[PDB]
Amino acid sequence: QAPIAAYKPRSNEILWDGYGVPHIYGVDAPSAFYGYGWAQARSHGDNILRLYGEARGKGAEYWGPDYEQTTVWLLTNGVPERAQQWYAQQSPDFRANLDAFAAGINAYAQQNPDDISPEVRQVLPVSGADVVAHAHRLMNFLYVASPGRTLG
Amino acid sequence: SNSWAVAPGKTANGNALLLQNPHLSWTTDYFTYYEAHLVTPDFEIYGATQIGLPVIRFAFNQRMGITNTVNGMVGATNYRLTLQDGGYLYDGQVRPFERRQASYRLRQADGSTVDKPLEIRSSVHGPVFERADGTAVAVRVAGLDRPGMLEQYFDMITAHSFDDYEAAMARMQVPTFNIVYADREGTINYSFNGVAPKRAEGDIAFWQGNVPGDSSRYLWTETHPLDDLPRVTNPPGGFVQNSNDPPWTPTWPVTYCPANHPSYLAPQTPHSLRAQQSVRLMSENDDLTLERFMALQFSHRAVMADRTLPDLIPAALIDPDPEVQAAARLLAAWDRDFTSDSRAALLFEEWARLFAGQNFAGQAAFATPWSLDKPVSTPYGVRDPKAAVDQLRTAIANTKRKYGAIDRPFGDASRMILNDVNVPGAAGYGNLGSFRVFTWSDPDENGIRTPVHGETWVAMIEFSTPVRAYGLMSYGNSRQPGTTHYSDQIERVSRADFRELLLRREQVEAAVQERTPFNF
């Protein structure tokens, strides 16, 4: 009839299983997003930082020539700046969650610097805006408006 | 990508069923899916999402769940400009460009950074780019004013009712994708979501090409409300589905048709054979159980064969070349399923490559063209058996050249290799009709090939109380150098041995291998 009683977490903790699947438990929303940020850093930290880096429109600056095309594409469409705008336009509640997520990623790197590829260490620290920017890049300038269809 | 949602009435136990089956590159970084589970005193969310995203796009819980597929929403326009007198011709006059001089740093081989100039010109349409051929193009992207993409998804997946869910989607903050829904209440839904510009003329094909950028006639400024887009809820058929095919067969029987929406929303092209298998696998089956549901997901039918072998085989047998004849007998003896032990499979693909183009989507070679009136049984037959046999003659060469014989075991050439794990492959190209997908790469010098795109995150959920779910990630839950969790699932994928997904606290505690306490 009614959904089984929801669990009431009384402390923050990630319980990892045999396959590296993180089970994040937070006493509140921001806590859970922080755990999520930490988990993703642990599992895919390198590529996440690299992608966040490109979202800032700094791919060419951070890693040179093979990233210059994307840099130009994202700058001409002013993605990185619109990301700052979208970040500011978020609701107070959700912006807090986004901030926690970035903090989680930062925290993991702070406690485990050895697990971060040298080349992407310069991206740190990340911010809620970075999270928003990448999402904006993925949705609107990769899926919807690809550099391919506009250029050929 | 595949997607299914089953109404309670179509099941044995009466609880809705949901399939998450997105298809993406196995190597592209931003396309990597991650599996997680978040729990607070106020909500719960299990599922997969692209790395870097703070929300779970493919989620479910004790109450509801959703999934996504590509619909291609044409949310942008590429206008061709008419350069003139330093500006661009528009509505009969030479208007000037908006020019902004910016700059960026380019890292040098030695580590230093050089400063590089970058001029950003804009027309009333949007940013302007110049193609290699010299064509000046301006791109106008819709929805640049929808900052709530992430939060919409968050509210959607944490919704307490279908109504709240729809309320969330209505904000029009997610620019694209087809989205399927199902919950413990028994409601299932399909939605052609995205932000589409309002236009007064031109079919989708028109808007996908270079639109004239010299008249305010083509300068749209508004976008459609959720109610103007193709949607289906609790249909008579008892299910919804989408496999990247146009939204004209979301269920059987259909509940609308192309004429009910503006012609620029979606294409009206022949549905892929895999999409056809989708409608057949769901409509043809009743009283489903979760177990039976998963079993159907493993379908790997060579539908293209069923459509062409009857006409090819006979014609190929009268050819004087004894090898062509042997090839014809090999193909004719095949059970038309992409199994590891198939000695005919590879040869068949090589033929299809020539008969239907490299992507297998070609239509010009069928006798009977596709028809929306017979959506799951057309096109059919070979138009020119004579020519078709020459193509087979060539395929025989191409097959031997690529794999070393015309009868090499499918699973001997098709392997799934991650780290040191090397297992036999099954299933294959979706355009040939395989529901479960594995877009095999070209073979190496030794005829070995592996998945380049295809099955990634696969889960099937039954909204019982409590809910029950199984899943698998082809490429593990991590890609950090030295992780043990990258190739530790591929073995189970090769046998379709799915993991039971753990949501309940007791279960989680029983399988825990590492505790990470934390403070925020």
Ligand SMILES: CC(=O)OCC1=C(C(=O)O)N2C(=O)[C@@H](NC(=O)CCCC(=O)O)[C@H]2SC1
């Ligand atoms: C050039 C351009 O604008 O297209 C970009 C693009 C590509 C591509 O070819 O790069 N796609 C894939 O690999 C397909 N993705 C799916 O089927 C999964 C859909 C659901 C999900 O991803 O969650 C489509 S999605 C958009």
